[PDB]
RNA sequence: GGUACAAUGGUAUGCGUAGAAGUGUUUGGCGUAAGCCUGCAUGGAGCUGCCAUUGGUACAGAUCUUGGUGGAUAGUAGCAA
RNA sequence: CGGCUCUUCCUAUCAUUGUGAAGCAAAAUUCACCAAGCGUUGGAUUGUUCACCCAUGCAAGGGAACGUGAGCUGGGUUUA
RNA sequence: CCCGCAGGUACGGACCAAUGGCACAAUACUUGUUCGAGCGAACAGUGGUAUGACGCUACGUCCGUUGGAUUAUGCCUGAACGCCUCUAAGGUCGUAUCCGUGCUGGACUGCAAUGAUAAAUAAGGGGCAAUUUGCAUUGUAUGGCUUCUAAACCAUUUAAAGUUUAUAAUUUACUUUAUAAACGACAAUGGAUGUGAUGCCAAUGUAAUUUGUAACAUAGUAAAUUGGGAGGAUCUUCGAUCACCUGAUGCCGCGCUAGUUACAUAUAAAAGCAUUAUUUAAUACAAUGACAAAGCCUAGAAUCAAUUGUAAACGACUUUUG
C-alpha cells in the first residue's frame, strides 16, 4: 500500500532520467484513494496486509534536501516494524503514511547501533596492499609485490583462497556494536535561534554547533537533527549509512554504561585547528587588518560620502 | 572483437565492445559519396536511398618488415580492403506474390458431397 | 487438465521409504509419466537417525577444492533430497533423462491443487509392508532440520491450515451425502432400472 | 586377380569450336572396393575404349621439399632512452 | 638440494575444550578416551636437511602435493 | 578454583577526530646562472634545506557472535538372566568438534511486491477482447466421440499396532471414557466405493448433410441483472484478490426429466460380397493468425552525449541537467 502523497524529491528514486521526465509517477495509483477507495483497492488491502501477513514493514524516504548535497533523489528502505499484535503494526503504518519520523523517537542515547554500508573504494590494488602479504625480497625478479606461491602443483588448479590482485573496497559492511554518545537536535528556531547548543554540554555550557570551524571537511555542513557515534562507521564522504537496533543482548559492563560528555571539540578539521568557536579567535587574536578595516570603513564613509555632496 | 576495450556508446548496439575507426569511417564516406553521385545521373532522389548491400573483402597484402632481436627479421604487413555498396530506393513496398498452378481432377465433390458442400454451416 | 494416463499421480510421501519410491517414480518417469510428490518432509530412511545423519555430513563434505561454488550443491530440503535420489536413477545427461526430470514435482508439504486433487500410494516402497517390527527409521523432515533447512515449521504451520481448511470439507461432505443417502429412498420407485439391473454388481452397489 | 597415371605398337571406316583436356557441383547412377559413367555450369583445341609392350606409374606422415594460407591478433605484443 | 613466499590437507594429539584413570590430599605430573577448531615463535653457528645452543613462551606436536626456479634467490651441488 | 572483573597476544573487518609517516614541487629562506638594476622570475629532468593543508596511510583508533542435534562420559527408568545391571526398547547430561544463526556472495539472467505505460492530438500508435466477423489454421476430439476423475484415505502417531459404526456419557475439537456388535492384512479391497455418488449423451435420432411430431401414472430441476456482512492467498494457467452469501428491483416467466404407450416425418447402403485401408475428420471443445471488418479506453520511459566524484584500468557505478 503506498500512499496519496508522495513528495517530489522522494519520487526521483524511480526515475533514472527524472529531468526529462513528465513525472507521470504515481500519477495514477494516487487516484485509488479519491475513487470508492476501500473497493477500489485500499481498504481490502490493509485487510489482506491483516489476515494473511506475519511480517509487517514500511517504505520510508530521507529528506536529502535538507543536507545540502548535490543528491536531491532520496533514499527509500524499507524499515521493519517490530511490535506485538500484527494488527498493531498496520494500525502504526496506516496512520504515519506521508508524517514524519525522528531519530529521537527510534534511537535513544547509550544505545548499541549496529552500522551497515559500503565501504571506501580502494580500486583495483595488489595482493600487499589487499590481502596483507609480506613483500618480497628486494633482489626478486618480476615483482616484489606478489605473492610467490599461487599453490601446489596439485590440485592442478589455482584455488580459491589463495590471495589475489582485484578490486579493494566499496565492499557491503555490517559493522556492530557502536554507541550513540548524543541524539542531536538540530534544525532551528524556537524563540529565537537555537540552532546552538548540541555541543554544549553540562561542563561547557559554550553553545557552538556540533559543525566545526569552516564545516566538516568534505562533506559539510550539519544543521539538521544527529547520532554521536563512538569511534567509526563505514564508507566515506557524505554516504548514507542506515542505522540500526541491536539483533544482541548486552551483559557487558562495558556496553551498558551511562555516559555524559564534557567536552567536544568543534575544532577546524582543515587544519591543525587551535580555536573551538570563532569568538575565541577573537578573545585570544585581536582585529585584523580585516574587521578593524571594515569596521572603520563604513562608520568613516558614513560621514565621508557627502564630503563631496556638501 | 579482441581486446578491443569496452566503451560506453555500445549498450546502444547491445554489445560491449566497440570503438571508433576513423579512417574505416572516411573511406565509407567517400564510397557513399559515390554512390549518392551516381544516384544523381541515374535520375534517383537521394533522401529515399537505403544501403541495400554493403560488403568488405580483404584484398591483396603489402610487404614490409620489422627488425628483431637477435637479427631476425619478421613481416609487417599492410591488409587492405575492397568495399562494395548498393544503395537501392525504398518507396511504399509491395513486396512480392508467388503464382498459383491447377492441380485439378474431376473426381473431387463426390467423396467430399457427403462432407462439405450440402453439409450445413455449423458453428 | 490431462495427462498420459491420468492428469499426474500425485503420490503422497507419508510413510514411503526413499528409495524404493524413488525407483518406481524414476522408472515410471521414464515410460512418459509426470508424477508429483507431496509430503516429502515425511519420506523414510531405514535405520536408526544418526545413522543416516551421519551419511548426510559426509556428503556435506564433498566440496571441489579449487572453487567450492563448483562443487557438489547440497540442497537440503526433504523435497530437493528425494530429487537427489531420483536424479540418480535417471540419466541426466541425456534429453530422454532430463525430459524425464521435468516431469517430476516435489514438494515438501502439499499445497497448489495437490491439496485438493487425488493422492494414490505406492505399496511396494510403503514402509509398513517392508521393514520390521524393531527396525529404526528417521524422516526426510527430521534430516533436514539438523543439516540446514529452514522450514520445517514454516511448513508445520501451513500444513495444520492445509488440515483445518481440511476439517469443513469434511464436514460438508459428511452432511452433503446424508441427503444422497436420504434422495436414494425418495427415488426408490425409480422406473425399476436399480431395482434389477445393477444386481449385475450386484449386492451392494 | 582387380583398379588409377603416362607412353609406344596396333586397333575402334572412334569422339571433338554444333565445344576436347581441365575445373566446379543437392544431376542421376553403377561398382564389396580402388574407381567409373553421366547431366548441367564454367572452359576454349585437343582427347578416349580395346589388344600388346611398358615406365621417372598411385602419398597423410619423412622436426620431408617448394609455395601459399589460417588462428593467435586489428589486439593486455607492441611503436615509453 | 635448501631457504624465502603462500595456500590447502592428514592425525600417528604437543597445547587448549569436554572427559575416564592413577601408587589422584593440594600443587605438579602420568596413562587413556571423543577430538584436527585456533595455535605451534625470535636468534647465534652451518648452503644444509635432523640434532644441539641462547631466549621468550600457559604450553614450543608429528607429516602430505620429491608442494612451490616462465615465483624469486643461487648459498650446496655440477661445464669451461 | 567455578564465577565475576580488568587488560593483552595473534588474526579479522573498517576508519582518520587525535598522533606518527608521505608532499598543495603551496610557501619561506638559500647556492650557481640568467634576465641593465629592483619582484609573490626562470633553469639545475624535484637544485637543496625547512614547515607544510587536502588526501592516502599504521606506528594510532573503534568493533569482533549465537542456538540446535548431540561425540566422549556420567546417570535415570528397566529387563531378558525371579536378583543385579547406563541398554535391549525407552529417557537424559553433553565438546575448542559438527550443522546452523549473525556476517559475505547471490541461478550470469532464480523468484516476489510495485511504479509508470510512447513519437498522441489532423492522423495513427498502444491496450481491453474473451464478445467482432468471415477467414484461416492449432490442439484435444478420429468417423457420435478409441473421456473425465482439478469431488477422495485424518494430522501425528504404528507390524499383535491398527479399524469402523452404534449407543450412553462428553467436548474449545468424529473431546475423552463405558458397554454391544461388525471382515479380527479374506475372495474382498487394486480400481471403481465413480468417493460434491461419473460420463461416448439428454434430445424416445443415438452422427463425415439428418431432424424429430401427441395422450396416462411419476418428478419437480438447471435458469440472465444494479448499491451490505462472513470467507479464500505454500517458486502463479489472467489479484482495481473475491465465490455459498443482507435486505431490494423487475423477466425468457423460458427450456425440463424419467416412465408406460402411441403416432407422423426425416437422414442413413460409398461400388465391396478376402469392404481395410492415404487408416484420415465435415463433429464438438479450447487457441493463435493475417487481410478491408464495430466500440471501449490510453497519452510513457530508457540509453547515449554532457555532468558528479561517495566511484574508476576501461566498462560499470553514485549523481545532476524547464
Known amino acids: 500500500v503506498w500512499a496519496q502523497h508522495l513528495s517530489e524529491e522522494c519520487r526521483r528514486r524511480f526515475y533514472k532520467n527524472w529531468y526529462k521526465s513528465k513525472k507521470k509517477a504515481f500519477t495514477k495509483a494516487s487516484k485509488k484513494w479519491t475513487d470508492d477507495l476501500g473497493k477500489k483497492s485500499i481498504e481490502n488491502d490493509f485487510r489482506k496486509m491483516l489476515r494473511y501477513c506475519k511480517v509487517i514493514r514500511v517504505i520510508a524516504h530521507s529528506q536529502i534536501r535538507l543536507i545540502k548535497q548535490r543528491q536531491k533523489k532520496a533514499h527509500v528502505m524499507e524499515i521493519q516494524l517490530n511490535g506485538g499484535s ?50 618480497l625480497p628486494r633482489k626478486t625478479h618480476k615483482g616484489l609485490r606478489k605473492v610467490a606461491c599461487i599453490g601446489a602443483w596439485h590440485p592442478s588448479r589455482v584455488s580459491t583462497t589463495v590471495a589475489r590482485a582485484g578490486q579493494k573496497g566499496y565492499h557491503h559492511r555490517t559493522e556492530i556494536n557502536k554507541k550513540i554518545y548524543r541524539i542531536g537536535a538540530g534544525i532551528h528556531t524556537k524563540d529565537g535561534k537555537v540552532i546552538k547548543n548540541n555541543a554544549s554540554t553540562e561542563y561547557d555550557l559554550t553553545d557552538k554547533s556540533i559543525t566545526p570551524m569552516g564545516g566538516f571537511p568534505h562533506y559539510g555542513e550539519v544543521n539538521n537533527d544527529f547520532v554521536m557515534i563512538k569511534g567509526c562507521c563505514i564508507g566515506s564522504k557524505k554516504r548514507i549509512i542506515t542505522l540500526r537496533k541491536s539483533l544482541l543482548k548486552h551483559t557487558k559492563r562495558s556496553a551498558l554504561e551511562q555516559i555524559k560528555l564534557k567536552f567536544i571539540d568543534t575544532s577546524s578539521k582543515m587544519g591543525h585547528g587551535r580555536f573551538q568557536t570563532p569568538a575565541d579567535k577573537l578573545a585570544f587574536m585581536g582585529p585584523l587588518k580585516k574587521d578593524r578595516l571594515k569596521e572603520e570603513a563604513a562608520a568613516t564613509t558614513a560621514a565621508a560620502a557627502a564630503a563631496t555632496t556638501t | 572483437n579482441g581486446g578491443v576495450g569496452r566503451c560506453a556508446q555500445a549498450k546502444q548496439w547491445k554489445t560491449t565492445q566497440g570503438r571508433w575507426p576513423k579512417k574505416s569511417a572516411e573511406f565509407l564516406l567517400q564510397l557513399l559519396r559515390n554512390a549518392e553521385a551516381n544516384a544523381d545521373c541515374k535520375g534517383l532522389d537521394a533522401d529515399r536511398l537505403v544501403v541495400h548491400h554493403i560488403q568488405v573483402n580483404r584484398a591483396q597484402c603489402l610487404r614490409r618488415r620489422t627488425y628483431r632481436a637477435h637479427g631476425r627479421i619478421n613481416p609487417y604487413m599492410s591488409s587492405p580492403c575492397h568495399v562494395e555498396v548498393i544503395l537501392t530506393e525504398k518507396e511504399e513496398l509491395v513486396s512480392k506474390a508467388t503464382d498459383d498452378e491447377p492441380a485439378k481432377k474431376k473426381l473431387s465433390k463426390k467423396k467430399l458431397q457427403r462432407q462439405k458442400e450440402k453439409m450445413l454451416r455449423s458453428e | 487438465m490431462t495427462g498420459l494416463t491420468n492428469r499426474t499421480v500425485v503420490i503422497d510421501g507419508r510413510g514411503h521409504l526413499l528409495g524404493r519410491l524413488a525407483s518406481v517414480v524414476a522408472k515410471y518417469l521414464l515410460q512418459g509419466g509426470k508424477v508429483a510428490v507431496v509430503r516429502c518432509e515425511e519420506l523414510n530412511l531405514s535405520g536408526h537417525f544418526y545413522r543416516n545423519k551421519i551419511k548426510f555430513l559426509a556428503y556435506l563434505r564433498k566440496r571441489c577444492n579449487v572453487n567450492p561454488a563448483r562443487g557438489p550443491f547440497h540442497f537440503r530440503a526433504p523435497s530437493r533430497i528425494f530429487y537427489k535420489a531420483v536424479r540418480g536413477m535417471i540419466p541426466h545427461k541425456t534429453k530422454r533423462g532430463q525430459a524425464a526430470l521435468a516431469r517430476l514435482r516435489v514438494f515438501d508439504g502439499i499445497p497448489s491443487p495437490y491439496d485438493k486433487r487425488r493422492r494414490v500410494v505406492v505399496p511396494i516402497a510403503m514402509r509398513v509392508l517392508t521393514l520390521r517390527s524393531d527396525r529404526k527409521y528417521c524422516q526426510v523432515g527430521r534430516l533436514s532440520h539438523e543439516v540446514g533447512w529452514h522450514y520445517q515449521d514454516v511448513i508445520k504451520s501451513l500444513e495444520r491450515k492445509r488440515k483445518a481448511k481440511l476439517r469443513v470439507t469434511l464436514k460438508h461432505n459428511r452432511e452433503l451425502k446424508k441427503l444422497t443417502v436420504k434422495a436414494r429412498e425418495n427415488i426408490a420407485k425409480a422406473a425399476e432400472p436399480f431395482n434389477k439391473i445393477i444386481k449385475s454388481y450386484g449386492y451392494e452397489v
Open chain 1, 86 to 135: 500484527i494488527e498493531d503494526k498496520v494500525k502504526w503504518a496506516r496512520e504515519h503514511l506521508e508524517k514524519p519520523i525522528q531519530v529521537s523517537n527510534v534511537f535513544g542515547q547509550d544505545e548499541m547501533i549496529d552500522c551497515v554500508g559500503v565501504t571506501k573504494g580502494k580500486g583495483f590494488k595488489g595482493v600487499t596492499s589487499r590481502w596483507h602479504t609480506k613483500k
